[PDB]
Amino acid sequence: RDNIQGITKPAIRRLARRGGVKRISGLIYEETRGVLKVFLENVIRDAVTYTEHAKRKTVTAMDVVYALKRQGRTLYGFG
Amino acid sequence: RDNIQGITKPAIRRLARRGGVKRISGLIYEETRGVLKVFLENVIRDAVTYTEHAKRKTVTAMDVVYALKRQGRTLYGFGG
Amino acid sequence: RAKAKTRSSRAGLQFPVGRVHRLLRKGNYAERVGAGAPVYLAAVLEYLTAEILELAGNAARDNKKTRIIPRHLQLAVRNDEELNKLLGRVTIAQGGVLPNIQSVLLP
Amino acid sequence: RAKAKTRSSRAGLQFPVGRVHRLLRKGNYAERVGAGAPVYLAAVLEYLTAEILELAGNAARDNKKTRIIPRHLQLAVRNDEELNKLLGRVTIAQGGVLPNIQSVLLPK
Amino acid sequence: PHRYRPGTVALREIRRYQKSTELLIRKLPFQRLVREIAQDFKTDLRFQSSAVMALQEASEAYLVALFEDTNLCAIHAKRVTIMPKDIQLARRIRGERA
Amino acid sequence: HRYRPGTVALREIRRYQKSTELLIRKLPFQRLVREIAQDFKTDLRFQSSAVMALQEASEAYLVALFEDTNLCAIHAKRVTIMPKDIQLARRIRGER
Amino acid sequence: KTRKESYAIYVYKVLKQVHPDTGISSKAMSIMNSFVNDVFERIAGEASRLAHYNKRSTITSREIQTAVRLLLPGELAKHAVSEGTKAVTKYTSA
Amino acid sequence: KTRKESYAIYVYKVLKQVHPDTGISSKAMSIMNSFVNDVFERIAGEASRLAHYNKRSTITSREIQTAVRLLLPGELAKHAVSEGTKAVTKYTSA
Amino acid sequence: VNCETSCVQQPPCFPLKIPPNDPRIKNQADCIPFFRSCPACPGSNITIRNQINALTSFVDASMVYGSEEPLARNLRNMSNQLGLLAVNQRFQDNGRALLPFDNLHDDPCLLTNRSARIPCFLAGDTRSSEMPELTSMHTLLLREHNRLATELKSLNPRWDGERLYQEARKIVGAMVQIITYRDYLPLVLGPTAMRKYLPTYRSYNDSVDPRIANVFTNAFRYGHTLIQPFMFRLDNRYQPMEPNPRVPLSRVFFASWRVVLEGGIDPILRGLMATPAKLNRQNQIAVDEIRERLFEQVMRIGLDLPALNMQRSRDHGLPGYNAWRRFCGLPQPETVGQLGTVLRNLKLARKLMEQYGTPNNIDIWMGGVSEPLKRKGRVGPLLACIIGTQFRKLRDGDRFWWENEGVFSMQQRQALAQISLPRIICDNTGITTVSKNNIFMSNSYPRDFVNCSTLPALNLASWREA
Amino acid sequence: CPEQDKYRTITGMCNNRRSPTLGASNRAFVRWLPAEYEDGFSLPYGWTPGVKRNGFPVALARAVSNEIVRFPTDQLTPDQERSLMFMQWGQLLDHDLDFTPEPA
DNA sequence: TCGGATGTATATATCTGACACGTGCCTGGAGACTAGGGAGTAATCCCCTTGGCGGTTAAAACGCGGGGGACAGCGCGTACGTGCGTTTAAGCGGTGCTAGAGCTGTCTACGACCAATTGAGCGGCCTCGGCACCGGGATTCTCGA
DNA sequence: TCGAGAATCCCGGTGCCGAGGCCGCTCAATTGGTCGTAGACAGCTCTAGCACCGCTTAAACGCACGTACGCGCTGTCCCCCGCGTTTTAACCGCCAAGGGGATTACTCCCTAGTCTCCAGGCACGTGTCAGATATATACATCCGA
Ligand code: HEM
C-alpha cells in the first residue's frame, strides 16, 4: 500500500501556495511527504492510544481532538 | 537605573562561546540585552503575581520556579 | 416558597452560573468551591464569548453575509493580537489562513 | 495486628507507595484513586530515576570524579535520545551544555 | 499564443488558495494514507468521517505553517526557491527535528 | 608572538563549553532583576535562591538562543552571527 | 437521544445581544462551544494550581481572579477581571 | 522547624543500588527531586484527563499505563510500562 | 444681531427654523436661538473653517485648575504659603469649603431665583455652574486638592507653597486620569470597544497626535440621552427629603442657590449616587425637559438639546453618517433596507429616510444616538469608535501620564492606584454611607451602599522627601 | 520650551517637544475628515434654503427632533445598570477635555 | 615545519568545608473494619461505516520550449579577534538590624449536604429564505513591443 | 504605453437544504436549614534579607593592527514553470449490509472514612576525606624561517 504517493505533487504545490511559497525545488515533494508521514504517525498513534483506552474499535473525532491537544495542537470545530 | 548595561559585552561573548559561536557581529549585544529583558520581564511578572496571591512581601525561589513552569521552561535544582 | 430566581439573573449574566458551579464542583479542581467563584468564571466566559462573537459578526458583515462561518471566526481570532496570543496553539477547522505574501516574492 | 509493612516493600520498589497514594488522593485529580495507581506511578518514577542516575554515574566515572555534580546529570540527559526528548523543555541548573562545534567553524 | 511569465501563475495561485477555506488535498487519497498509517498501530480499525476530516484539517494547517517557516528560512538565505535544507532548518529551530 | 584570528575564539569555545559556572556577574544581575521587579511591586524582597534561579534560567535561555542563531548563520553561508539570525530563530521558535 | 448539554443557547443569547440580525451556523456553533470549554478548563486548572500552592482547600474569586490574570494576555485579562468583579458584586447585592 | 519532605532518601537508595562507589552532591539531589516531582505531576495529570474523558470518577492503573504510553517517548515508555506492570503484579501477589 | 432675541440668519448667527405644526411653538416666524462656533482663522477665504478647543486636550484636571495663566493664578490661595485653592469667603457647607464666586456682566445664576441673589461658581471651566450636581463635583475636587495639600504640608513641613500646589495639582490630575480610564470609559465604550481602542499602555509616543477631533465635540454628546427628567436630593437617611425631594429639571438649570442655601452639596451628591440614569432607547431619545424645556429662566424660550446638537454638527461642517461609518470599517447604508439593518429598527429607519432622504444626509449626532447601544456600553459602534480613538490619542500622547516614567515614583504610583471617587466624597463631605466600587454603576440604596469607614484613604507617606 | 520641566504647564505647553504648539489650549481642532460644508469651506449644510445636499434637500433640525427624538415623558425608562454619577462624570470629563467657544 | 611561544593536562602537596552518618522523636502511613455508589457485565436499537456499481468530468500526468535564478569564480573594504596596559567594582569576610516568614491559639461563618418543587433547556418537527448554484456582462491583471 | 487572451468580479433567477421558531417534558437548578471545619484574625519567635565597610584583585575597558570574512558583481546552464493532450480516478448518487456506538438495568466489589499506634523520616550535630587550590613539568598545539 504505497498510499503516500496519493498526495500528488500538485497537492503539495497547493499547500505551499496557501503557505505563500512562490517557487518550489524538485526535491521538496519527497521531504514534504516525509514530514507529513512523521506528523501523521505521531498524531494517529496518540489518537489510537486514546481509542484503545476507551475500549473502542472506531477512531472518533474526540480521540483526534485529544491527540492533537496532547501535542499542543488544539483543534476547534469537532468537539 | 540603566542596569541592563550590567550585562557586559565580555559576558555576552562568553555566553555565545558556550553556545558554540566562533564569530560575533557588533550589533548582537543590544539584541541579546533586549531579548534578556523581555524574558526576565515575563518571568518576573508571573513570579510577582504568584507572590502577591500568597500575600507575601518577599519573592521566593518557588515563585520563580512556578513562573518558569508556566512559561513552559521547567527549571531543576531550585525548590521542588 | 418564593418564586425561583436563577443565579445567572441574580448576577446579571446569560451563561449559567449554576451549571458553571456544577462543572467546577465535579471538575476535580479543589475540595470546595466558593459562592462567588462560579459567578466570576461565568462572567469571564461570557465576556470572552462576547468578544469573539462581536469580532466574528463584524467579519461576516464586512463579507456581506448574514450567518457566521468558521472562516469569519478565524479572521476574527487571527487579526487580534491578544486573541491570537490566547489561541496561539489552536487550529480553527475550515477557517483557512490569513492572506500574506512575502515582499520579495512580488514582481 | 501485625508489623507495618510499607506497600513499597511488598512491591519491591525504592519509592514510597503510601506517600504517592497520599499525593494522588490530595492532588485534586479524581474523586477516587485506585490501589494500583500508586504502585504503577512509584515504579515508573523509580525506573526513570534509576536510568538517569546510571547515566550520570557513567558520566562522572568518565570524568574521574567520585561525587555526582549537575554537569554529570546534564551530560547524562543530553547524550540519551529518549531522556533528551522527555526533558526537552527542562533546564538543569549548573549543568552547562554539550560540547559541540560546527564543522564549518573548524580550522581548515 | 499567450504565455505568462514563470512568476505570475504561482502568485495568482497564492492569492487564490489563501482566500479560500477548502481542503487542498484530495479526500480519498488522504483517507487511504491515514488508514495505511493507522494500520501500523491497530488492524481492522474503523474511522469516523469526522475523525478523518479532523486529521485532514490538522495536517493541512501543520503543513501550511511549516511551509511559511520554510519560506522564511529560504528567504533568509537570499533565495526564493524552497529547498529541503530550509525545511530541515525550520524543523530544527521549531524543536521538531532538534 | 601572535595567533591568527579564530584560534583563541575556538579556544574559548572549548574552555567555556566545559565549565558549568555562570557566565554573568552576580551583583549586576541582582541589580537588573530588582530593577525589573520594582515596576510590579513596592519594597519587594528577593531570596538568594530566587535570583540564582532567575540567573540560571536566563543564561540557559540565552545559550540555547545563541545555538539557534549560529545555526541560522550557518544556513546563510556565513560564519558571523547577526541580529537577523536572532530574529529568525525567535520567529521560527514562536517567541516573536 | 441524550440531553447533550452545551453552550448553544448562551452563545446564541450573547450573539443576539451583539448581532441580533446576524445568525450562526453549525460549525461556528461547534467552534464557539470548543473555545468556551477550552478557556473554562484553562482558568479552572490555573486556579486549582494556585489554591494547591498556598495549601488552600477552596477555590474562591481570588483564585479565579489570579488565574485570569496569569492566563489571559494583556488588557484582555484586565477586562475579564472587571467583568467578574462586577458580577460578584451584583450577586452579593441580591 | 516543621518537617519538609522530599524524595532525597529514595533517590540516594536508588543511586547506591546503581553506583555503590559514586556519591551525589546537594544541587544534584535538588535536581533529582525536581525531576521526580515533575514526572509525577505529568503522569497524574494525564491520568486525570483520561478518567474525565471517559465519564469515570477513578484513576486506576489502566489510566496510569495509558498516561505512561502517551508521555514517555519510544523505547523508554516500553521499559517503563513493563516496570510499572511488574510492580503492580507483585502488589497483587502480596 | 443678538441670537437670543433675533431670528434672522446672519453671521455669526445661524438659528433653527420652526417647522409647521410644532407642538410647542405655534408661530412660524419664531426660531430656536443658535450660535455658530468661533472660526480658527476668521477673515480667510482660502483656508477651510475650523473650530478652537479652548481647553488643553489632556486629562490634566483642567476643570479644577483651568487652562489659562490668569485663571489658574486666580484659582489659588495667595494669602498664605500652603498652596491651597481659592475658596468661598461668604458661605460654607456645614464648615466645608465652596467655590469662590465670579463676577460676570451677564450672571444667569441670579435669574433662576431673584430672591436668593446667589451668583455662579468659579472654577476651571466657564460652565461649572451648569447644574447643582456639576457644582457638587467641582466642590468635591477643590476640597480634595485642599485637603491633599494640607496633608502634604503636615507630612513634609519643609515644602513651600508653590511646590505643595504643584504636587497637589499633579496628584489631582493623576486621580482624574485614573478615575476616567478605570471606571468611566469601560462603562461608556463597553469592554470590546475599550479593549480595541484603548489597549495596554506601552510608553509615551511623541509622534501620536494628542489633539481633540472636531467630531468628538459632537460624538461625546451621547450623554445628552441619559439626562433624567428630575433632580433628586436625599437626606442623611437616603430618603426623599422635603421640601421638593424631586424637582423639575427646567427649574434646576444654572441655579447655584440650590447649592448655597440648601445645605451645601451633600443632598445633591447623595441623590447623584442614589438615582438611576435614563436608558437610551430608539423610541425615547431625549426627555422633553431638555428637548422642549431647556433653559426657561435664562432666556426667552425653552431649548431643544437634540436639535442644538444636530445643528452644531451641521454648522461645524462634520461629514454625514456614511463617511464616519467609512472611517471605522463599517458598511455605509444607501437604501431604506440597509438603514433598517444597520439601525436594527425599521420604523426608525423609515422616519430617518423620510426626514433626510439619503443615509449620507444623516447628522452625526442623530445617527450616533440612533443605532443601538453596544453590549455593556451606552454608545453605538460609530460613537464608540470615535470616543475610543480620541481617548487613545489623549492617553498615548501624554508625556506626563500617571503611568509614564519620570512623572510619579513607583511607590507613588502604587499609592495612586488605590484611589476611588467614593473615598474623595467621604474625605470631603459629611456623607457617611457611600456607594460601592464603580460609583458610576451603583444607583439603589441600600442595595449597593456601604458604611465608608472601611475604604482606605490615600497614603501620602510615600511623598516624604528627605 | 525649557530643556527640563517637572510639572505640566498651565496651557499644556511643551508636552510634545518636537511640536510645542501642538496639544495646548486655545488651539484649533484636528480633523479626521475634510470638512463637508454646503459650499465646501464656508456655508453649513442648510445655510441657504433650497440648496440641496448631495442632490437632496437639507432637513430641518427641529423637525428631525420633533418626528424622531420626541416621545411622551411618562414613558421614561430608568437605567438599571448606571446612575446619575455616570452622567455627571461625563459632563465633568467634557468640561475637562473639550469646550468649543461661541460668540456672546 | 622548527624554536620558542603561549597554553594546558598532569603529577605532587595542602587546607577545607560539606556530605555521609549517628540520634531523638513525632506524625503520618499501616492495619482493621463498615457503608455506599461506580462501574463491570450483559442486552437491545439503530446509525453510520464499508463495500460496490456506474456515469461525469476534474484533475493528475507526460512532454516540451524557454528563461531566470541558484551556484560557482573573483575581488575589495572593513570589522572583529588578539594582545597589551589601565581602571573599577566583583567578590569576600565580617558587622549589626529589624521586616517579615512561620508557627500557634480562638472563633465564626460559609460551603457541603439533604429534601421538596418547578421550569430551562434539550430533542424532535416543520418551514421558509440565505445562499451555493448556473448563465452572462463588465473589469481588469498581464504579456509582448 | 496599447490589443489579445485569460482570470476574476459581480449581477439576475432557482430551488434547496440548513438554521430558526415552536411544542412537551424531564432532569437539573433553586429554596430552606444545619454542621463544623476551614479560614480570618491576633500574637509571639527568630531567620535572613538588607545596608555599610575595607582589601585584594580578577576582570572590564579602551586602544593598535591586520587578517579573514561579508558583501557585491559576473557568467552558465539547467531546473523549474506554464501550457496542450490524454488518461486516471475523485466524486457524486443510490443500494444494501451489518458491526459497532450509544443506552438501560443489576449488582458487587472497591474505594472513602474512621480509630489506633508505631516506626520511617526529618532536623540536629560532627568529623574526615574528596576537591579546589598552588607549583613545576612535559606535553599540546600554532606560525613564519
Ligand atoms: C445633564 C445635563 C446636560 C446639559 C444641560 C447639557 C447642555 C449642553 C449644551 C446646551 C451644550 C451646547 C449645545 C450646542 O452645541 O449648542 C452642550 C455641549 C456638550 N455636551 Fe452637554 N449637557 C448635559 C450633559 C452632558 C453629558 C452627560 C455629556 C457626556 C457624557 C455631555 C457632552 C457634551 C459635549 C461633549 C458637548 C460639546 C461641548 C461644547 O459644544 O461646548 N453633555 N451640553
Residue numbers in the entry:
A (entry chain B): 23 to 101
B (entry chain F): 23 to 102
C (entry chain G): 11 to 117
D (entry chain C): 11 to 118
E (entry chain A): 38 to 135
F (entry chain E): 39 to 134
G (entry chain H), H (entry chain D): 28 to 121
I (entry chain N): 113 to 578
Please give me the paper's original passages concerning this structure.
Here we show how myeloperoxidase (MPO), a highly expressed neutrophil protein, disassembles nucleosomes, thereby facilitating NET formation, yet also binds stably to NETs extracellularly. We describe how the oligomeric status of MPO governs both outcomes. MPO dimers interact with nucleosomal DNA using one protomer and concurrently dock into the nucleosome acidic patch with the other protomer. On the other hand, MPO monomers stably interact with the nucleosome acidic patch without making concomitant DNA contacts, explaining how monomeric MPO binds to and licences NETs to confer hypohalous acid production in the extracellular space.
All of the samples incubated for 2 min or longer contained a mixture of several molecular species, including free MPO dimers and free nucleosomes, as well as nucleosomes bound by MPO monomers and dimers, respectively. The MPO monomer–nucleosome complex (the monomer is composed of the heavy and light chain that originate from the same precursor polypeptide by proteolytic cleavage and loss of residues 107–112) was refined to resolutions of between 2.9 Å and 3.0 Å, and its structure closely resembles that of the rMPO–nucleosome complex (Supplementary Fig. 5a; root mean squared deviation (r.m.s.d.) of 0.88 Å over 1,608 residues). Indeed, MPO, like rMPO, uses arginine residues Arg473 and Arg653 to bind to the acidic patch between H2A and H2B. Thus, rMPO and MPO both bind to nucleosomes identically, but only MPO (which is a mixture of monomers and dimers) efficiently disassembles nucleosomes. We acquired a dataset of such a sample that contained only two stable molecular species, free nucleosomes and MPO monomer–nucleosome complexes. Consistent with our biochemical findings, monomeric MPO and rMPO lack the second protomer that displaces DNA from the core complex and therefore do not destabilize the nucleosome. By contrast, monomeric MPO does not clash with the DNA end and therefore does not displace DNA from the histone core complex. Instead, it even protects histones from eviction by MPO dimers as the acidic patch is preoccupied.
